[PDB]
Symmetry: D2
Subunit: 122 residues, 4 copies
């Protein structure tokens, strides 16, 4: 799944995730959100199961973006946790957590949760 995961992916929001999967389990790349307080590409890094089970199971992985780049700083970070599923209709199915920096008093309202599905087309 180094081969399967490496490449450009697109989610339901029209965001673009460009990733390289290394031999040893690393994920590196860039993320460009179609939504939110984001412009242009942001660094991402993560990890994946480089020796998944061979039984029709997905490959577990995750990655982070901090929403700071040369253009904007949204004082926030998203992590996506999910699985890669190969085949003609390959997919990365994820759930995500977006934490903003907050005061202590507002920490209860720090974190959004959602779900993104990535495909190799659209």
């Amino acid at each position: 799944d180094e081969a399967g995961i490496t490449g450009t992916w697109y989610n339901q929001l029209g965001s673009t995730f460009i990733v390289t999967a290394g031999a040893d389990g690393a994920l590196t790349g860039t993320y460009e959100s179609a939504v939110g307080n984001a412009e242009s590409r942001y660094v991402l890094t993560g990890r994946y199961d480089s020796a998944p089970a061979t039984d029709g199971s997905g490959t577990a992985l995750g990655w982070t973006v901090a929403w700071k780049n040369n253009y904007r700083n949204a004082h926030s970070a998203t992590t996506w946790s999910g699985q890669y599923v190969g085949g003609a209709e390959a997919r990365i199915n994820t759930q995500w957590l977006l934490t903003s920096g907050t005061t202590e008093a507002n920490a209860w309202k720090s974190t959004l949760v959602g779900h993104d599905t990535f495909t190799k087309v659209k």
Copy 2:
């Protein structure tokens, strides 16, 4: 917060998170879980807001562990999303998502959610 975040952290479960925060927003290190299908240290990587707001707000960050190392392969990955809060009682308050690789039929039961609080003591 490069200074504040770099170091060894411990959560409520007795897990140990050893991290280096780079100038440019990178997080690198190792994680050792006190629980679950885990032994010894696992690579982690992540990202943080390297220019947080200066208003008493936390610093947003996140990181991933894939639960594969030389000892075990748990076909799973956790991402932690949270904020660093500095001061005499510094803390990293997180929520996490642990995805296992699953068959398609079992993908509904792929993902655990929880919350870990890291301190510099215990």
Copy 3:
């Protein structure tokens, strides 16, 4: 949206949610899961925004099932939190949390998270 929400709904897993929305914000009904340690119908109760905003916004709602009925007891409960979106292709888009009773030592692994989309067909 009393009218819109009341009725039979079906999710992507093939589960069936039969609900009545009361004037005053109550949700009552039954749930039958196509997956998991479940058989036949389980009681549900919940709440919805009975005076939503009139601006194209969804209607917030939520409900709970405890997975005990006359046939089985799965020592667990799911809550769905989401929004109803009306129109020709009405939908209830949710995220859910399924907590199992656990020992204290296993409480870290108590809670699954996922997402279900309900429609009036299938």
Copy 4:
């Protein structure tokens, strides 16, 4: 655990949850949030495992509040999913999802996640 759960509970934010646990698995009561766009008491309803396991395990439960009452309408609903743990230091440990009604374009940012711990004191 009808006996154990029925009563007044307080969380880390200073919110108050007043609940009655019925024989048959129902939860009914009121919730008053110390934070957010909330004033005074809101109806809640939910469900619990009325025949939990007898092995030191918690009792699974959940409940919903829609944030509409006679004073305010926050176009939102929270569900708490968790477990009751009895004994001298009884607790209800929960994770929650707060969904707001949103436009379709903003549905990605509809849902907050967090965690509340309820005790019988404070």
